Amino acid sequence: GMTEYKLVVVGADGVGKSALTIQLIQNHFVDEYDPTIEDSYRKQVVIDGETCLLDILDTAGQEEYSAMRDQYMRTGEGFLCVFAINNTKSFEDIHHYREQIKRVKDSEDVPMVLVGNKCDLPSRTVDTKQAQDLARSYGIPFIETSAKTRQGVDDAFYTLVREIRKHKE
Amino acid sequence: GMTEYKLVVVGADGVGKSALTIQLIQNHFVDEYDPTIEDSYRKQVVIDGETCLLDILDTAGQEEYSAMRDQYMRTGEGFLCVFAINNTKSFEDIHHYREQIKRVKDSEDVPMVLVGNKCDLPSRTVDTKQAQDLARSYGIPFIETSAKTRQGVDDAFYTLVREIRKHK
Amino acid sequence: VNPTVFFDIAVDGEPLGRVSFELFADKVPKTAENFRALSTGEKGFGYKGSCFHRIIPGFMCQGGDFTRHNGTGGKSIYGEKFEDENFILKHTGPGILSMANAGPNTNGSQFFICTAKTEWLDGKHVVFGKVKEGMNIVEAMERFGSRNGKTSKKITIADCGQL
Amino acid sequence: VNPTVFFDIAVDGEPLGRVSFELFADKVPKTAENFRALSTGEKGFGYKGSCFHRIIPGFMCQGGDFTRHNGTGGKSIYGEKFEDENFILKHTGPGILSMANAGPNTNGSQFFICTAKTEWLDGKHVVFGKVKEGMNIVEAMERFGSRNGKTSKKITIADCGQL
């Protein structure tokens, strides 16, 4: 059988968690805003000549429900931590998410990828080196994406699978 | 907030687990045979005066996948073990279902309820007596149901919630 | 005196029953009039034929997107969206009728009907009505919902109007 | 000689593309002929207009229920059901076309297309063909599946016949 990878997409709402996920799964761009309750998706892909099964959980960032994030973080194997490059508050929210994933998993070594989305937009407020320095200090990869143009969408999900394999050995 | 209860229904295929679950959930009877992959349902109810949320996992009884059945067995708090009163095979399968559940949970007493279903049929191959004597050995309730006429549906699952509550 | 509106609910086209609502124009007149006018269709658009797109047993039934029919749309009689009128009334229990939104001051036409007390929504969603008759219809609609709100049948407002 | 049949697949009525199949009449003639004849409709009924009711990404796409259109029906050109003809051919990888069933000797019209090796089905489901052209279309159908197989759009055989 093919190995299954449980990926969880997290971040403040409005950053593009769902748009990135729907691009991966369906290869089109959701222009409308449908703030997420919880959705799960399945896709098989070839990563490094190895077919595997991606199980993707697309989550709610609603702050009212921050203390209910715990069960999905316990079950998830790796995490796409998403912010929008035109929203400094979503970048600041990243720390709170990473801290919470570590605190819930009780481990400093959790597969994660930092994703800066909306890189098609001109109104950027978070420097690339600012996000890179942050990713470096976490010890995780950083990828800029656009769910609209598809830039980096596969790279982000495939790189997280590669982080899960590394952590697994 | 209301308390939530995660229940899991098991049994060989064709016995009426989904028709029982769908009768509990939708009060509708499925006369067509649609074998299950995996389904989850939610229903709010009042049991002994307390409102609660039932989260019900309806499972497949294919033997090829009995390995993975372990996983939901971890998450489930109680098990409705269904056989059909015109299917001796599904009755013999019950013992196997009990053994595995007791394995995966690593206890002798898991919240659990035996269900003899289809009790509307004029045919019977499993006597009430047999299923009573089996249930009594294990120390769990026994209820005959009929999804077709809806007899005993609510009793089965509430009793199950009342077995979860009593051991919780 | 507070107006009363009704929905005739259908499930995959088959009649389920009538639910009616009292709209609290005495306390939220702007928000009550929006819902009233959308129920009658008098502005040339409204709830008739739209679906309950999100039903989460134990919590609520949500609908009101008549422009896109996918949960993202809807519009008010004042413009696509309008401001939060007040938060005087609370989500006290089943039958409360309240506005959906996407943050402060984004009321359109989507609305939800509580099937439980949802106190943490107080101050965030404008409560403007409550079920008068037919709460058992709303309870019956929960049989077609799920944990993330996806419905297993098409639940429609087959007809609606003012009483 | 092994005949070839095709399905033209649509997504919510929108043409998606064509999948063609080689049918292994030279190892399972009775099973091949059933699928051939249901793909042409030459007996008065068959696949045209039916849906793919279960799509599970990573495993398979299943359809063929043209009598009930809900996943429980279907029928062969030989009557209700017919026997497992043999298990010579195995579920070796993507593209395998095999018969769905509800136990031994219950073949009707429902079938599935593997998108992966499913060797635990070997000796239980009769393999009788393989995708010839259009595997990319079967792959695209997985865009619309889910873990338990419920589809998120209506996937139909808008046309089908013999090449």
Ligand SMILES: CCn1c(-c2cc(N3CCN(C4CC4)CC3)cnc2[C@H](C)OC)c2c3cc(ccc31)-c1csc(n1)C[C@H](NC(=O)[C@H]1[C@@H]3COC[C@@H]31)C(=O)N1CCC[C@H](N1)C(=O)OCC(C)(C)C2
């Ligand atoms: C964390 C899980 N989770 C829950 C929730 C929470 C809880 N705990 C239990 C414990 N309790 C404490 C003791 C009190 C707290 C709640 C349990 N289980 C759940 C569910 C079943 O776990 C999957 C929810 C919830 C809600 C959201 C996201 C995730 C959520 C969410 C997304 S968007 C929104 N909410 C507001 C939404 N906006 C739009 O639709 C915009 C669209 C675009 O612009 C027009 C239109 C809107 O207005 N409403 C109208 C109002 C009800 C509201 N939808 C909605 O559906 O709430 C769902 C629900 C279940 C009530 C809450």
Ligand SMILES: CCn1c(-c2cc(N3CCN(C4CC4)CC3)cnc2[C@H](C)OC)c2c3cc(ccc31)-c1csc(n1)C[C@H](NC(=O)[C@H]1[C@@H]3COC[C@@H]31)C(=O)N1CCC[C@H](N1)C(=O)OCC(C)(C)C2
């Ligand atoms: C345990 C969960 N689970 C899985 C499964 C299993 C695994 N593995 C097993 C193998 N391991 C290998 C050693 C390593 C790895 C882990 C992983 N994840 C899953 C899924 C995604 O978790 C939800 C399955 C599966 C299948 C059934 C029930 C549950 C299942 C099931 C129900 S009925 C049936 N099977 C036969 C059915 N009959 C009818 O539909 C009758 C209807 C009425 O009369 C005409 C018509 C039929 O003919 N087919 C045509 C053929 C494929 C088949 N359906 C089907 O859909 O298989 C689904 C699937 C995913 C291929 C298998």
Ligand SMILES: Nc1nc2c(ncn2[C@@H]2O[C@H](COP(=O)(O)OP(=O)(O)O)[C@@H](O)[C@H]2O)c(=O)[nH]1
């Ligand atoms: N220009 C642009 N817009 C995007 C991008 N990703 C998401 N959006 C828009 O941002 C809004 C929120 O997207 P969504 O996927 O719902 O965010 P979520 O709350 O994180 O799931 C929607 O309007 C999307 O169309 C992107 O990469 N570029």
Ligand SMILES: Nc1nc2c(ncn2[C@@H]2O[C@H](COP(=O)(O)OP(=O)(O)O)[C@@H](O)[C@H]2O)c(=O)[nH]1
């Ligand atoms: N006569 C009768 N038939 C039933 C009853 N419950 C289920 N069935 C039928 O038994 C067949 C199998 O039912 P189903 O719910 O799919 O069984 P499951 O596989 O165990 O989930 C279907 O045709 C049902 O309509 C019952 O109480 N009485």
Ligand SMILES: [Mg+2]
């Ligand atoms: Mg989202």
Ligand SMILES: [Mg+2]
């Ligand atoms: Mg079933």
